[PDB]
Design a protein around this ligand. Sequence first.
Ligand SMILES: OC[C@H]1O[C@H](O[C@H]2[C@@H](O)[C@H](O)[C@@H](CO)O[C@H]2O)[C@@H](O)[C@@H](O)[C@@H]1O
Ligand SMILES: [Ca+2]
Ligand code: NA
Length: 712
Amino acid sequence: MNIQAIDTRHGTANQHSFSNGNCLPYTGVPFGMNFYAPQTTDQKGSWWFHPEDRTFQGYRVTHQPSPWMGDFSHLLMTPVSGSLSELSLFHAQSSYRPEESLFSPVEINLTQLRYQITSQLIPSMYGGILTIDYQQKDNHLLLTLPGRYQVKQLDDHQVAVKVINYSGCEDPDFSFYFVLHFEQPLTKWFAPSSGEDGKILLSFGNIAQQVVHFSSSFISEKQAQLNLAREISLRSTEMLQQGIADWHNYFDRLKVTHENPEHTKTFYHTLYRTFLFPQTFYELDENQQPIHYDTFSQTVRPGVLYTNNGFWDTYKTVYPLFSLIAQEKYEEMLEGFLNSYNETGFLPKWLSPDERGLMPGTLIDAVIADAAVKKIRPDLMPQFLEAMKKGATQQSERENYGRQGTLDYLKYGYVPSTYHESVNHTLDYAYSDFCISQVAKTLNDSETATFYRQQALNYQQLFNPETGFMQAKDTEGNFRPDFLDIRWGKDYAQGSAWQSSFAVYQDFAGLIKLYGSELAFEKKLIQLCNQAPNFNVEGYGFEIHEMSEMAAIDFGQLAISNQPSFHYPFLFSYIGKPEMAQPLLKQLMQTFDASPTGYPGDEDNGSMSAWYIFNSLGFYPVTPGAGEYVIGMPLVQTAEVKLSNGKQLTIQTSPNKVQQQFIHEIQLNQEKHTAPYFTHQELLNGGTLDYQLGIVPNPQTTAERPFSLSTE
Ligand SMILES: OC[C@H]1O[C@H](O[C@H]2[C@@H](O)[C@H](O)[C@@H](CO)O[C@H]2O)[C@@H](O)[C@@H](O)[C@@H]1O
Ligand SMILES: [Ca+2]
Ligand code: NA
């Protein structure tokens, strides 16, 4: 699909109480340092765009990854005509007709009805071009400069801005530089000025058209001017062509077709949201050397840096997809994440722009381990192992960094119930320990590999054979009483025992043994899927959107609206019964579409988009760090996958209509494939992946199972 037909209002119909993706209409280049979006309201906090709004407050320069993290280093540009007594966003706001507007990754185009202005914003990595067509005779641009700001007019054609605003930052004076070069001159001089919450009305007089070339920096005003100088000669049409080519570079790596073209539209909307995050957070100096801002030391440092990622979300799907088709990006992003460690002492958890420390676990360990077993940045793995061992053995004095209850986990083999979300912390630490083990193994550090492989079995500490759930446990080894299987929070993050008891990616075979048998585990999975989507709110004291999103649909406790349940259909693959989940996976993919209500829950910076892409192709990385993809049920009829190693994997299904809900047979390069998984190596060889599909199941009797520590 051509990038101009992607509508960025996909997944934007949200509020605090209910998510259909909690996406913004991000205009930008892939991994752009800034994104650009219309702002329709300043009265709904982080939810500053709604597709049903008919009000336009301005073009917002944003770094907002989610409404939960909020924004950093934002400002607005608002075309105006005539006098304005008061410069507030409300006083300057114009209605607009959404149905006559363009919302695309490479272009925003809309008409402010109040002013008879039509304007067009095209993005670049560090800036963009805003073209403004005026019908009236006293023509302006309003700059809204939140937080502490500085602004000056350098000449008739040049303005420079600095803003200090953020939701959370280690640097209380965290600064963003923004420069504007105008084709048509300013007709009113103003003196350099500074303040809080700036409202600056630039004047151009009676011109029909203004063209604003803008750029930006987290380094300096001088760096922002160099970023601009690199593209100042481009026309809007040339910058648009370049931005379309940048997106085509990534879109061309997954060319797919479907029986239903609605499914193809959904695919490419999700693919657009797979190459936004993490955002570029470095610039190239006068010598083309990567530099970035280090909020910890409050200085400019050398090297790459990336931002706007919660690894709790993105480790699931984004980095595994990059491992197949964007290895060059994965390689540079790992270098940034290590720089984050170099600068703070701990591998990053939630970057926006710097460590915000939200969500359980240090799932960055899975991004590292998956890369190690796939031979991505082997050069960095000794530095990563040292970083991982430090996180697994040393408690940070600052609450947002590394592991919580590190020392108690080492003493007890679990985080005790006195800690918040102890079950998640425990299971995330045991999976991290598997990940550390895998990195050690790739480096032939046998002693480290062995110790961490044993630590990875600590999930067994919270398994209650009496209930068949993971439950919180006190320092004397007693399960918290008054257990209710559907009670959310307290011991579990954003779920009940049902959304929390299966985070054992390292050893499903061992979790299955705790149940007693492949059959007793099967019974639990059937009960998880086939029950009503009931919840109890006591752990929170109120209903939260993740509960509402599960209870909105009839898929039992398989809460596809949130990351904890993402792997659930694949659990059937660990008892040799993948056929039980093939229909379920096609039914789950139908909860996605290209509309403003198009996701079942928070998209989270590529995480749920890449869930959809992988499942569309029919395989899924259950266990980052194992070098495998568990087989599911494809929705495509064809895919040409351009692998980073330069080979092509061509996928072909038999006719893949609604009634096709099972896999009959798979041939990989004309050889019957019976295993319920593919190795990463197998897919990297390229060739032909043929799925013969069925209207009834073809049960396999193969003993073959995906990776588990306890059986390797
Ligand atoms: O974007 C940050 C983080 O957001 C998630 O959780 C949000 C919100 O959805 C949830 O209701 C409350 C629970 O009190 O927590 C907020 O931080 C979370 O799903 C995660 O996916 C994401 O990284
Ligand atoms: Ca989420
Ligand atoms: Na939805």
